[PDB]
Design a protein around this ligand. Sequence first.
Ligand code: MG
Ligand code: MG
Ligand code: MG
Ligand code: MG
Ligand code: MG
Ligand code: MG
Ligand code: MG
Ligand code: MG
Ligand code: MG
Ligand code: MG
Ligand code: MG
Ligand code: MG
Ligand code: MG
Ligand code: MG
Ligand code: MG
Ligand code: MG
Ligand code: MG
Ligand code: MG
Ligand code: MG
Ligand code: MG
Ligand code: MG
Ligand code: MG
Ligand code: MG
Ligand code: MG
Ligand code: MG
Ligand code: MG
Ligand code: MG
Ligand code: MG
Ligand code: MG
Ligand code: MG
Ligand code: MG
Ligand code: MG
Ligand code: MG
Ligand code: MG
Ligand code: MG
Ligand code: MG
Ligand code: MG
Ligand code: MG
Ligand code: MG
Ligand code: MG
Ligand code: MG
Ligand code: MG
Ligand code: MG
Ligand code: MG
Ligand code: MG
Ligand code: MG
Ligand code: MG
Ligand code: MG
Ligand code: MG
Ligand code: MG
Ligand code: MG
Ligand code: MG
Ligand code: MG
Ligand code: MG
Ligand code: MG
Ligand code: MG
Ligand code: MG
Ligand code: MG
Ligand code: MG
Ligand code: MG
Ligand code: MG
Ligand code: MG
Ligand code: MG
Ligand code: MG
Ligand code: MG
Ligand code: MG
Ligand code: MG
Ligand code: MG
Ligand code: MG
Ligand code: MG
Ligand code: MG
Ligand code: MG
Ligand code: MG
Ligand code: MG
Ligand code: MG
Ligand code: MG
Ligand code: MG
Ligand code: MG
Ligand code: MG
Ligand code: MG
Ligand code: MG
Ligand code: MG
Ligand code: MG
Ligand code: MG
Ligand code: MG
Ligand code: MG
Ligand code: MG
Ligand code: MG
Ligand code: MG
Ligand code: MG
Ligand code: MG
Ligand code: MG
Ligand code: MG
Ligand code: MG
Ligand code: MG
Ligand code: MG
Ligand code: MG
Ligand code: MG
Ligand code: MG
Ligand code: MG
Ligand code: MG
Ligand code: MG
Ligand code: MG
Ligand code: MG
Ligand code: MG
Ligand code: MG
Ligand code: MG
Ligand code: MG
Ligand code: MG
Ligand code: MG
Ligand code: MG
Ligand code: MG
Ligand code: MG
Ligand code: MG
Ligand code: MG
Ligand code: MG
Ligand code: MG
Ligand code: MG
Ligand code: MG
Ligand code: MG
Ligand code: MG
Ligand code: MG
Ligand code: MG
Ligand code: MG
Ligand code: MG
Ligand code: MG
Ligand code: MG
Ligand code: MG
Ligand code: MG
Ligand code: MG
Ligand code: MG
Ligand code: MG
Ligand code: MG
Ligand code: MG
Ligand code: MG
Ligand code: MG
Ligand code: MG
Ligand code: MG
Ligand code: MG
Ligand code: MG
Ligand code: MG
Ligand code: MG
Ligand code: MG
Ligand code: MG
Ligand code: MG
Ligand code: MG
Ligand code: MG
Ligand code: MG
Ligand code: MG
Ligand code: MG
Ligand code: MG
Ligand code: MG
Ligand code: MG
Ligand code: MG
Ligand code: MG
Ligand code: MG
Ligand code: MG
Ligand code: MG
Ligand code: MG
Ligand code: MG
Ligand code: MG
Ligand code: MG
Ligand code: MG
Ligand code: MG
Ligand code: MG
Ligand code: MG
Ligand code: MG
Ligand code: MG
Ligand code: MG
Ligand code: MG
Ligand code: MG
Ligand code: MG
Ligand code: MG
Ligand code: MG
Ligand code: MG
Ligand code: MG
Ligand code: MG
Lengths: 117, 150
Amino acid sequence: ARVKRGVIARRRHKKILKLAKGYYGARSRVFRVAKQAVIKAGQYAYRDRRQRKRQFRALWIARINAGARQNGLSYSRLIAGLKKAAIEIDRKVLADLAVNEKAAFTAIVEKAKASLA
Amino acid sequence: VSGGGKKPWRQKGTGRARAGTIRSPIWRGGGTTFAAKPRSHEQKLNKKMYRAALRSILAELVRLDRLVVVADFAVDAPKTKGLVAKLDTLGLKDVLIVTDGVDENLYLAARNLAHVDVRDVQGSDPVSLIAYDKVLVTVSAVKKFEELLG
RNA sequence: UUGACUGCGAGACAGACACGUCGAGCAGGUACGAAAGUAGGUCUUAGUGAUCCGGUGGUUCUGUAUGGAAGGGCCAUCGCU
RNA sequence: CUUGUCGGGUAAGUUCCGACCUGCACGAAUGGCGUAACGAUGGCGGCGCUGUCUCCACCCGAGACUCAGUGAAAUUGAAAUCGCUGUGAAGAUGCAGUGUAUCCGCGGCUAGACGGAAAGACCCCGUGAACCUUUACUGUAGCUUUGCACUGGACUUUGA
RNA sequence: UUAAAAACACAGCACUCUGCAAACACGAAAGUGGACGUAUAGGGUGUGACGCCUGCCCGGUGCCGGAAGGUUAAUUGAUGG
RNA sequence: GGGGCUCAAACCACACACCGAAGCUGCGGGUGUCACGGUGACGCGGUAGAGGAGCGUUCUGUAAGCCUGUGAAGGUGAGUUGAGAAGCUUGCUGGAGGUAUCAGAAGUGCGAAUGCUGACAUGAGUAACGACAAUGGGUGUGAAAAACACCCACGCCGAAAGACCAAGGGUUCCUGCGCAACGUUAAUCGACGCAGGGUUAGUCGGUUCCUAAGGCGAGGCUGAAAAGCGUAGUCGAU
RNA sequence: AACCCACUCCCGUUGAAAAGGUAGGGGAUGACUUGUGGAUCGGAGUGAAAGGCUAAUCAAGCUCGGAGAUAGCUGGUUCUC
RNA sequence: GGUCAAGUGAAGAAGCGCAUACGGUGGAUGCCUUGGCAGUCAGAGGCGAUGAAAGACGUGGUAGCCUGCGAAAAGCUUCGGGGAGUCGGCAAACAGACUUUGAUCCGGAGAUCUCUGAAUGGGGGAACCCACCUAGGAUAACCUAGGUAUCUUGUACUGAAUCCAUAGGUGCAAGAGGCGAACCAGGGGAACUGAAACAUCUAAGUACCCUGAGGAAAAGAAAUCAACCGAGAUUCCCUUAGUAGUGGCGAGCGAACGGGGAUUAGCCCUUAAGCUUCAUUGAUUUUAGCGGAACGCUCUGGAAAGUGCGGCCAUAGUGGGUGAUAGCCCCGUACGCGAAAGGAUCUUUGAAGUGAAAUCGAGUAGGACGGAGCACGAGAAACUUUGUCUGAACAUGGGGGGACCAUCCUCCAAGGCUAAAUACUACUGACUGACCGAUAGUGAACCAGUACCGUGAGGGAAAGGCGAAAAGAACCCCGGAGAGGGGAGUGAAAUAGAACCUGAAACCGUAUGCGUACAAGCAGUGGGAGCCUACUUGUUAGGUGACUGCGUACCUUUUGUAUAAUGGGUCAGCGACUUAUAUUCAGUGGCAAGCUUAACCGUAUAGGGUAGGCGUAGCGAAAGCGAGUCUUAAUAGGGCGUU
Ligand SMILES: [Mg+2]
Ligand SMILES: [Mg+2]
Ligand SMILES: [Mg+2]
Ligand SMILES: [Mg+2]
Ligand SMILES: [Mg+2]
Ligand SMILES: [Mg+2]
Ligand SMILES: [Mg+2]
Ligand SMILES: [Mg+2]
Ligand SMILES: [Mg+2]
Ligand SMILES: [Mg+2]
Ligand SMILES: [Mg+2]
Ligand SMILES: [Mg+2]
Ligand SMILES: [Mg+2]
Ligand SMILES: [Mg+2]
Ligand SMILES: [Mg+2]
Ligand SMILES: [Mg+2]
Ligand SMILES: [Mg+2]
Ligand SMILES: [Mg+2]
Ligand SMILES: [Mg+2]
Ligand SMILES: [Mg+2]
Ligand SMILES: [Mg+2]
Ligand SMILES: [Mg+2]
Ligand SMILES: [Mg+2]
Ligand SMILES: [Mg+2]
Ligand SMILES: [Mg+2]
Ligand SMILES: [Mg+2]
Ligand SMILES: [Mg+2]
Ligand SMILES: [Mg+2]
Ligand SMILES: [Mg+2]
Ligand SMILES: [Mg+2]
Ligand SMILES: [Mg+2]
Ligand SMILES: [Mg+2]
Ligand SMILES: [Mg+2]
Ligand SMILES: [Mg+2]
Ligand SMILES: [Mg+2]
Ligand SMILES: [Mg+2]
Ligand SMILES: [Mg+2]
Ligand SMILES: [Mg+2]
Ligand SMILES: [Mg+2]
Ligand SMILES: [Mg+2]
Ligand SMILES: [Mg+2]
Ligand SMILES: [Mg+2]
Ligand SMILES: [Mg+2]
Ligand SMILES: [Mg+2]
Ligand SMILES: [Mg+2]
Ligand SMILES: [Mg+2]
Ligand SMILES: [Mg+2]
Ligand SMILES: [Mg+2]
Ligand SMILES: [Mg+2]
Ligand SMILES: [Mg+2]
Ligand SMILES: [Mg+2]
Ligand SMILES: [Mg+2]
Ligand SMILES: [Mg+2]
Ligand SMILES: [Mg+2]
Ligand SMILES: [Mg+2]
Ligand SMILES: [Mg+2]
Ligand SMILES: [Mg+2]
Ligand SMILES: [Mg+2]
Ligand SMILES: [Mg+2]
Ligand SMILES: [Mg+2]
Ligand SMILES: [Mg+2]
Ligand SMILES: [Mg+2]
Ligand SMILES: [Mg+2]
Ligand SMILES: [Mg+2]
Ligand SMILES: [Mg+2]
Ligand SMILES: [Mg+2]
Ligand SMILES: [Mg+2]
Ligand SMILES: [Mg+2]
Ligand SMILES: [Mg+2]
Ligand SMILES: [Mg+2]
Ligand SMILES: [Mg+2]
Ligand SMILES: [Mg+2]
Ligand SMILES: [Mg+2]
Ligand SMILES: [Mg+2]
Ligand SMILES: [Mg+2]
Ligand SMILES: [Mg+2]
Ligand SMILES: [Mg+2]
Ligand SMILES: [Mg+2]
Ligand SMILES: [Mg+2]
Ligand SMILES: [Mg+2]
Ligand SMILES: [Mg+2]
Ligand SMILES: [Mg+2]
Ligand SMILES: [Mg+2]
Ligand SMILES: [Mg+2]
Ligand SMILES: [Mg+2]
Ligand SMILES: [Mg+2]
Ligand SMILES: [Mg+2]
Ligand SMILES: [Mg+2]
Ligand SMILES: [Mg+2]
Ligand SMILES: [Mg+2]
Ligand SMILES: [Mg+2]
Ligand SMILES: [Mg+2]
Ligand SMILES: [Mg+2]
Ligand SMILES: [Mg+2]
Ligand SMILES: [Mg+2]
Ligand SMILES: [Mg+2]
Ligand SMILES: [Mg+2]
Ligand SMILES: [Mg+2]
Ligand SMILES: [Mg+2]
Ligand SMILES: [Mg+2]
Ligand SMILES: [Mg+2]
Ligand SMILES: [Mg+2]
Ligand SMILES: [Mg+2]
Ligand SMILES: [Mg+2]
Ligand SMILES: [Mg+2]
Ligand SMILES: [Mg+2]
Ligand SMILES: [Mg+2]
Ligand SMILES: [Mg+2]
Ligand SMILES: [Mg+2]
Ligand SMILES: [Mg+2]
Ligand SMILES: [Mg+2]
Ligand SMILES: [Mg+2]
Ligand SMILES: [Mg+2]
Ligand SMILES: [Mg+2]
Ligand SMILES: [Mg+2]
Ligand SMILES: [Mg+2]
Ligand SMILES: [Mg+2]
Ligand SMILES: [Mg+2]
Ligand SMILES: [Mg+2]
Ligand SMILES: [Mg+2]
Ligand SMILES: [Mg+2]
Ligand SMILES: [Mg+2]
Ligand SMILES: [Mg+2]
Ligand SMILES: [Mg+2]
Ligand SMILES: [Mg+2]
Ligand SMILES: [Mg+2]
Ligand SMILES: [Mg+2]
Ligand SMILES: [Mg+2]
Ligand SMILES: [Mg+2]
Ligand SMILES: [Mg+2]
Ligand SMILES: [Mg+2]
Ligand SMILES: [Mg+2]
Ligand SMILES: [Mg+2]
Ligand SMILES: [Mg+2]
Ligand SMILES: [Mg+2]
Ligand SMILES: [Mg+2]
Ligand SMILES: [Mg+2]
Ligand SMILES: [Mg+2]
Ligand SMILES: [Mg+2]
Ligand SMILES: [Mg+2]
Ligand SMILES: [Mg+2]
Ligand SMILES: [Mg+2]
Ligand SMILES: [Mg+2]
Ligand SMILES: [Mg+2]
Ligand SMILES: [Mg+2]
Ligand SMILES: [Mg+2]
Ligand SMILES: [Mg+2]
Ligand SMILES: [Mg+2]
Ligand SMILES: [Mg+2]
Ligand SMILES: [Mg+2]
Ligand SMILES: [Mg+2]
Ligand SMILES: [Mg+2]
Ligand SMILES: [Mg+2]
Ligand SMILES: [Mg+2]
Ligand SMILES: [Mg+2]
Ligand SMILES: [Mg+2]
Ligand SMILES: [Mg+2]
Ligand SMILES: [Mg+2]
Ligand SMILES: [Mg+2]
Ligand SMILES: [Mg+2]
Ligand SMILES: [Mg+2]
Ligand SMILES: [Mg+2]
Ligand SMILES: [Mg+2]
Ligand SMILES: [Mg+2]
Ligand SMILES: [Mg+2]
Ligand SMILES: [Mg+2]
Ligand SMILES: [Mg+2]
Ligand SMILES: [Mg+2]
Ligand SMILES: [Mg+2]
Ligand SMILES: [Mg+2]
Ligand SMILES: [Mg+2]
Ligand SMILES: [Mg+2]
Ligand SMILES: [Mg+2]
Ligand SMILES: [Mg+2]
Ligand SMILES: [Mg+2]
Ligand SMILES: [Mg+2]
Ligand SMILES: [Mg+2]
């Protein structure tokens, strides 16, 4: 029972080269280079699912700082006053009101400021 | 494999991978690394461990209603047409016929018949009794199975 | 005066193995002491070399048809900077 | 030791020539000391001659360069392939900070890519290999001693 | 096919072996070369035209000679066990 | 680390706030062990290595079955399903075979071994085009002349770069027709392709006659065997 | 001079050439050069001796066998959870 | 509406990137097969001086090469078969013919049979040169047909030294010589390797060289083993048993007795079985052939064997191929028949030879020295054999029983011949395969031991596929009376067009969309505007990715690699834990104080065969004793074992 490798081997190279679509030069059209490129791409994707959560919180905090200082307060004092009063709204929702619902953001900063924090 | 006696090139200096013979398993026309030789795929099965499977097979034919028992089974003169007609009265198409002795007339008929086999009590193997859709035995063949299988 | 005894030996210490160390107590016969008793070398820790092979003293073992012998086994003991 | 010391040759001589004897460690057929002629032999010094040089200049042919035709090679993980100062498998185009910088050829030069070429030849290791040596071990061809055989007669000396 | 030389050869010198079926060499052997030669010849070794010369040591190792005496092989087989 | 920093953005004390990880919590999933009869609690980084469970490929049985010219295997896209190896459905191409399920056997899964074979890149339209005796016109032929043919005129060898024997080679010799490949460029030309033709001996050279070195060698002598040496003889030119 | 050789410089080193070329250089009646035929070879031959030469291969030629010699040494070793 | 100033900044690509669509190169993949590989059952086991194996040259209507033939040359003569086409293949055309008065074709027998080659009349550089003798025929410068090697054996004639006769010399008869893959019996005889070095030892009496014989060979009928009971020639298989032994007592080597089988057989020296060759009695095979059953309609289709419906044959139903898948279309198949003439085997019964050595075994048995063989390496070393040297007895005698002696037992050496069971396959036929399917399988599917390489011995490739059928593209146009194309035609299909099935990847192009000329690095990943396309007209799908956070390949080897440490230019195909025999443990089964067979029979996976192996009892070095036993003076103690 002699087994030939032709059909299975070709069907396995084509799976890798389909994931390397859009890469530059030999990274999309030769298997040896493309196999390494696909592994590295998956390595970055696993790592960058952690970093997406970090990058967005750093952007919400930056926008809340910009919108709190327009009402006369800093970010670190606004967060201390929200905890002091009762408010437990996300930073994602807080940064959304800063850009879109500017009148509702002022009432929150004024409520946090009445807690003297 | 024929040929391949001397080194293709010298050990050092040529800038090529080391070679010792042109008929090496790595090369194109070279030999097979673990080439086969003729051998026997014969196992050992105990005498009593073979008879217990016959008992187990025969008991399952009765439970599954594949075993048919008749009082003698014979045909006169070797004719496939004559044997085909007699099996239709019993309603059997794919049948294994087991008898105490395979008569010459019964053997000559059913030889060219497609889904019918005629065997002997000691000629009936484990595979045939599972393969055919029905097994038709005679009373003499039944009294011989109990002798051999206890 | 010969206990620098013979057969053992509960139990331990050490320790990869092969080796090594201590030892109450029992049986045989002893030596000193009136006796209880002490004695299985020396105050203790170095002074040593496996197996194979060959030699010597014993032996209710074996011994190529049988009776013996040769040879072999067992116990003791000699030959290695 | 040592470029020993003295003399000659040069403006200046670790080389050269002549001596001294303190011969690390000359020496008499593995010959000692000389020697005419000879040497594509080693060292030193002169005359002539000169682009060897100060210090290069001009000129003539064949390439290099451009056009038409034919058409290789070693090499090559992939490249969107800068400098500096640090860091770091301890000498970075690729890391960090920083500075510079539009995109692409052609003619030239070789500072780097620890550039290409040859599984380092130097060094060590392997209870690796070859060949060579001998008063290493064990053998052995050849040469040689004696017994028996082929192989006999007689006389004499001489021991049991 | 990176070394042409001071390296090799050389004429000359010396030592030593060889009496002819020579020494010596190639050959399991027959045989062949030496040589259809015969010590003014043949082989081996060292030195290296020519000139003047070539000193001392025979303890070591080799070679040559001697044969008295010690050891000393196969062989033989007294005696004892 | 840089910009820059002097009642600091430095240092020394104290205070409160905030940022900050794959750590902890929240929400939704998957798994291992143990306990109880699907719930609980407590785990789930990993090389050498041990243990457990699977996917896919070729062949045999199931299978004289089932699918298939109203289109098999194979190739090429799209969609979709699982934790993964992978599965499934379809458009186009192709034109005749394939193998559900459960078992049984393995030439059973490649990126590396300065791996083997074939194909194709980079260097790159880059080096080079093989003695620096040397070429310039005119005409002809031709699809097309620097190179072919002829003419006029220059150069080079001439103890050869001219003639002739021998060895070696073997049709390369001449003619007609050709230019794909070969010719380091083109070619109408050729030691190139196709087809014909061409070599005439008493005196030339062999053979025949004779021998050298040497070979072989009846008988013969020697040697485990194969064989060695050698006499008569008979081969062997230079 | 021819012929045989190979002392120097340069070029060439992917060469016109797996050892050449242009300039110079040595011997050139002899221990000369050369054609044809023949003899000696693998632990063997031959060597005015360099461990040189024996078909671009020599501190033991090439070829085929023992043979897939041995390699405590480098390299490689292919699907999933 | 102007002028000025400031701010802002679309489009415009020499060329590149990604995606997509079409191509080109290339030859993978799939399917296929006239070629290979491994078995089983038979055959017959040789060919050659009557010239072999292996060749050179020739031979055809037309050039070459294969295949046959041999100057009578793809053939000549005879028998036997058959029953209409034929003049071999690559490989076609044009021609000439052959014949139902029996051709091509197949089988038996005959004739011819060049040159080389053991090569054999003598020489030679294989395929060449030169001769002599006898008989017959021509007259010129020959022709035809036979002979002429060497050695051995036999026979006849003859005749040296030398008298006789010996050597020697000629003439006749018979035989031999060379080739062949293996098997057999002998002569000579390694080393690598292992012993983790290496000498004894091993590898191994293997590899290799040489000499003989046969279809088989060899060996074979007790001067053999056993053990006081017996067996009964040789050969081969399974056990005893990896035991007894042997061994630098290391690595290793390794029996026999006793059992179970296959085969069955002995006969002579007071002359036998047997074997060989001729002549006859019958039988059976082999070399070629002959007969050999049963189907229609319909649908799709280029073409049915496929669909749907209904039948028939069966001692013949999973054969090959016919335009897609056929028991009933063809060739076959099961089953019956068949030989002018050759070969072979077995059978009678006759002759001849041989067996054959004469007469029961003398330089023999035994011994000493040095070696070989026995599983046994000097060891207490028996037995066989012999290179050197010696040397008996005569059945009231001699040989063995593992140093040696005594007693018993058992045989009769120094003379022969014998089948079967066993070994092998270069060669021929049939069948088979959980073998390969063109980088595989033989090196070789194809004009392969070729091309090519080497002075030679020797080494040694690559290279398959149009279509069902050549129906292989008439004719027109461009082009050099080209190469190559554009139409037209054939075909079911020419993007099936001869470099022809399918036709992947690397690699090279054309077209469209988006991006790219102030920008620094493993080229991705997370976020993300703008543009383009499609349509479900924006919480959609697809293509690009300005700008921005993070981010120094993979393998190996290492304490540690982005490492400037190794390896890889890329793609496609291939490429490394296997198999056999002995075992131990685990899982899963059958039997169970028992379990299981091996060789071998066999109706052949059944059934038989329980020789043997393991278990049910241990202790001791052993004799031995035994739920105990060993040590010991010891029933004490202790070791091992026991429900
Ligand atoms: Mg992209
Ligand atoms: Mg692509
Ligand atoms: Mg070889
Ligand atoms: Mg070899
Ligand atoms: Mg290299
Ligand atoms: Mg192969
Ligand atoms: Mg059985
Ligand atoms: Mg049937
Ligand atoms: Mg302890
Ligand atoms: Mg007292
Ligand atoms: Mg007392
Ligand atoms: Mg020892
Ligand atoms: Mg005895
Ligand atoms: Mg004794
Ligand atoms: Mg000095
Ligand atoms: Mg001085
Ligand atoms: Mg001075
Ligand atoms: Mg000077
Ligand atoms: Mg002197
Ligand atoms: Mg001296
Ligand atoms: Mg002097
Ligand atoms: Mg000279
Ligand atoms: Mg001088
Ligand atoms: Mg000067
Ligand atoms: Mg150009
Ligand atoms: Mg740059
Ligand atoms: Mg540093
Ligand atoms: Mg640095
Ligand atoms: Mg980087
Ligand atoms: Mg950086
Ligand atoms: Mg970093
Ligand atoms: Mg440049
Ligand atoms: Mg330069
Ligand atoms: Mg450079
Ligand atoms: Mg380098
Ligand atoms: Mg290497
Ligand atoms: Mg190295
Ligand atoms: Mg060295
Ligand atoms: Mg050592
Ligand atoms: Mg070591
Ligand atoms: Mg010279
Ligand atoms: Mg020189
Ligand atoms: Mg010299
Ligand atoms: Mg002399
Ligand atoms: Mg000298
Ligand atoms: Mg001198
Ligand atoms: Mg003296
Ligand atoms: Mg002396
Ligand atoms: Mg003397
Ligand atoms: Mg916080
Ligand atoms: Mg977090
Ligand atoms: Mg966590
Ligand atoms: Mg959870
Ligand atoms: Mg884990
Ligand atoms: Mg964890
Ligand atoms: Mg279709
Ligand atoms: Mg398939
Ligand atoms: Mg698909
Ligand atoms: Mg398809
Ligand atoms: Mg088919
Ligand atoms: Mg299946
Ligand atoms: Mg494989
Ligand atoms: Mg790999
Ligand atoms: Mg690959
Ligand atoms: Mg890998
Ligand atoms: Mg390479
Ligand atoms: Mg590779
Ligand atoms: Mg180009
Ligand atoms: Mg360049
Ligand atoms: Mg250039
Ligand atoms: Mg140029
Ligand atoms: Mg030129
Ligand atoms: Mg040139
Ligand atoms: Mg030229
Ligand atoms: Mg012209
Ligand atoms: Mg010209
Ligand atoms: Mg002139
Ligand atoms: Mg000629
Ligand atoms: Mg030629
Ligand atoms: Mg011509
Ligand atoms: Mg012409
Ligand atoms: Mg042209
Ligand atoms: Mg041309
Ligand atoms: Mg021509
Ligand atoms: Mg002669
Ligand atoms: Mg001779
Ligand atoms: Mg002779
Ligand atoms: Mg002559
Ligand atoms: Mg002549
Ligand atoms: Mg010449
Ligand atoms: Mg010059
Ligand atoms: Mg010159
Ligand atoms: Mg000259
Ligand atoms: Mg001179
Ligand atoms: Mg001469
Ligand atoms: Mg020779
Ligand atoms: Mg040699
Ligand atoms: Mg030297
Ligand atoms: Mg050669
Ligand atoms: Mg040479
Ligand atoms: Mg071997
Ligand atoms: Mg090897
Ligand atoms: Mg390495
Ligand atoms: Mg633009
Ligand atoms: Mg472009
Ligand atoms: Mg057979
Ligand atoms: Mg036979
Ligand atoms: Mg032929
Ligand atoms: Mg004739
Ligand atoms: Mg006829
Ligand atoms: Mg002849
Ligand atoms: Mg002859
Ligand atoms: Mg004759
Ligand atoms: Mg002749
Ligand atoms: Mg013969
Ligand atoms: Mg050895
Ligand atoms: Mg060893
Ligand atoms: Mg070893
Ligand atoms: Mg060694
Ligand atoms: Mg041996
Ligand atoms: Mg022998
Ligand atoms: Mg025969
Ligand atoms: Mg015999
Ligand atoms: Mg016997
Ligand atoms: Mg008896
Ligand atoms: Mg008998
Ligand atoms: Mg029929
Ligand atoms: Mg069929
Ligand atoms: Mg078809
Ligand atoms: Mg059919
Ligand atoms: Mg029909
Ligand atoms: Mg007798
Ligand atoms: Mg006699
Ligand atoms: Mg004897
Ligand atoms: Mg002896
Ligand atoms: Mg012996
Ligand atoms: Mg011993
Ligand atoms: Mg004797
Ligand atoms: Mg005897
Ligand atoms: Mg005896
Ligand atoms: Mg005895
Ligand atoms: Mg006899
Ligand atoms: Mg066959
Ligand atoms: Mg293919
Ligand atoms: Mg092939
Ligand atoms: Mg091949
Ligand atoms: Mg040749
Ligand atoms: Mg049509
Ligand atoms: Mg197509
Ligand atoms: Mg097609
Ligand atoms: Mg193609
Ligand atoms: Mg087809
Ligand atoms: Mg095609
Ligand atoms: Mg492609
Ligand atoms: Mg392009
Ligand atoms: Mg474009
Ligand atoms: Mg700027
Ligand atoms: Mg830009
Ligand atoms: Mg850049
Ligand atoms: Mg995104
Ligand atoms: Mg989108
Ligand atoms: Mg991005
Ligand atoms: Mg980015
Ligand atoms: Mg970054
Ligand atoms: Mg390292
Ligand atoms: Mg290191
Ligand atoms: Mg790297
Ligand atoms: Mg790192
Ligand atoms: Mg690297
Ligand atoms: Mg780098
Ligand atoms: Mg390196
Ligand atoms: Mg390294
Ligand atoms: Mg690597
Ligand atoms: Mg590399
Ligand atoms: Mg069980
Ligand atoms: Mg006890
Ligand atoms: Mg106990």
